[PDB]
């Protein structure tokens, strides 16, 4: 209990100075989540696609118009409508076909 | 404490009152606050201290009975108003006549209220950067309280 940070969330912090006093040694083993702190999976009845379709039910006028479809999409993802409207062809042709990729 | 009872025949009966806790930490203190080394360490939040100087209906007791010095009387009196306005003394409400009831409005939560809410005008023209009209918070009487912040408290908000 020498460590000044509680050891109950991320790892157990142990700090020690070497005899000469030139090095600080840190021992930080992980803390595993206790079994009592978990919940059971709800086995009785699922892909993220299926969740999306149920959320975006096509009810009004069969395939919805832009304004209705975009307004519903914005509510589901907690955004504004503007994100969803398309862009012209000056912008579409400027985009890189092969952007770089770091790993 | 003597109370008058009526029957007409009216009589006042004296009853024993609890006495001060013995052995004050700092004897030779003239005023009660100073005897216990509380000169600059009480604020409106300290109801336990303030309630001792309050009448059952929320009024302040006279200076002579309490014995407080003028400087601390003013400070104690001011904090009680702020304590009353902050809703910290629910059992010391006014003695409304039987023919009256509370205003029945919802109550806005307040704290550190210098003035009576009824008589403060709105600041319509607030002013620009080095012209701002300031909204007072707290009481100037308490400027001399011990401060545990890097710089003095911001009275004007």
């Amino acid at each position: 209990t020498y460590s000044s940070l509680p050891d109950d969330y991320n790892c157990q912090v142990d700090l020690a100075l070497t005899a000469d006093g030139r090095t600080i040694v840190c021992y930080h083993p992980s803390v595993d989540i206790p079994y009592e702190h978990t919940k059971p999976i709800p086995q009785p009845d699922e892909t993220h696609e299926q969740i999306l379709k149920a959320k975006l039910e096509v009810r009004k006028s069969k395939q919805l118009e832009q304004g209705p479809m975009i307004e519903q999409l914005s509510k589901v993802f907690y955004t504004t409508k503007h994100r969803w409207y398309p862009h012209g062809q000056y912008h579409n042709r400027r985009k890189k076909l092969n952007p770089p990729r770091d790993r | 404490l003597r109370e008058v009872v009526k029957i007409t025949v009216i009589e006042g009966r004296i009853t024993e009152t609890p006495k001060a806790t013995p052995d004050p930490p700092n004897p030779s203190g003239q005023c009660p606050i100073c005897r216990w080394n509380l000169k600059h360490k009480y604020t409106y939040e300290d109801v336990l201290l303030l309630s001792q100087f309050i009448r059952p209906y929320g009024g302040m007791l006279p200076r002579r009975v309490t014995g407080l010095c003028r400087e601390e009387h003013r400070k104690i009196e001011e904090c009680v108003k702020m304590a009353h306005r902050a809703g910290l003394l629910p059992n010391h409400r006014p003695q409304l006549p039987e023919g009256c009831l509370p205003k029945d409005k919802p109550k806005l939560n307040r704290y550190l209220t210098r003035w009576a809410p009824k008589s403060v005008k709105p600041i319509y023209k607030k002013g620009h950067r080095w012209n701002k009209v300031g909204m007072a918070v707290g009481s100037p009487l308490l400027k001399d309280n011990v401060c545990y912040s890097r710089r003095p408290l911001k009275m004007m908000h």
Binding site: R22, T23 | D46
Partner: protein, 155 residues
Amino acid sequence: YPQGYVPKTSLSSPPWQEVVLPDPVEETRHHAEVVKRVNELIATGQYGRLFAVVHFASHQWKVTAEDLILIENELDIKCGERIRLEKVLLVGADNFTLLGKPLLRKELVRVEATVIEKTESWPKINMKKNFRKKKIIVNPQTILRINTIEIAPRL
């Protein structure tokens, strides 16, 4: 009630909570115990990948085996030559780390690199107007691959 006693109030005590630090004598024993535990882990090789913070040029790099590092200057080393980076400020593993004050000992940590490429930067435009009052800056560069980080039980 002792001298200088104030009943509890809002302003009586500081907002912060005073702490009681462990007694020095017992902590020194604990420090030795902790150091020994980590030292045995190093001796038995109970660790995986290592990462070190190394001071090179005028910059600090969080580095690890197989990493690539770009240096904004010539280094005087031929391509393909192995080098040892000698300033390590921190070496870490999954379960432990060692910190220098400000640098670790030579014995504790040995980091080795290789010079893979010597090149020059792309043309950078400096223009303090005209379109011809322009200077193009290319500066020499070197890329270093980091090959190994090794530690020994000399704690």
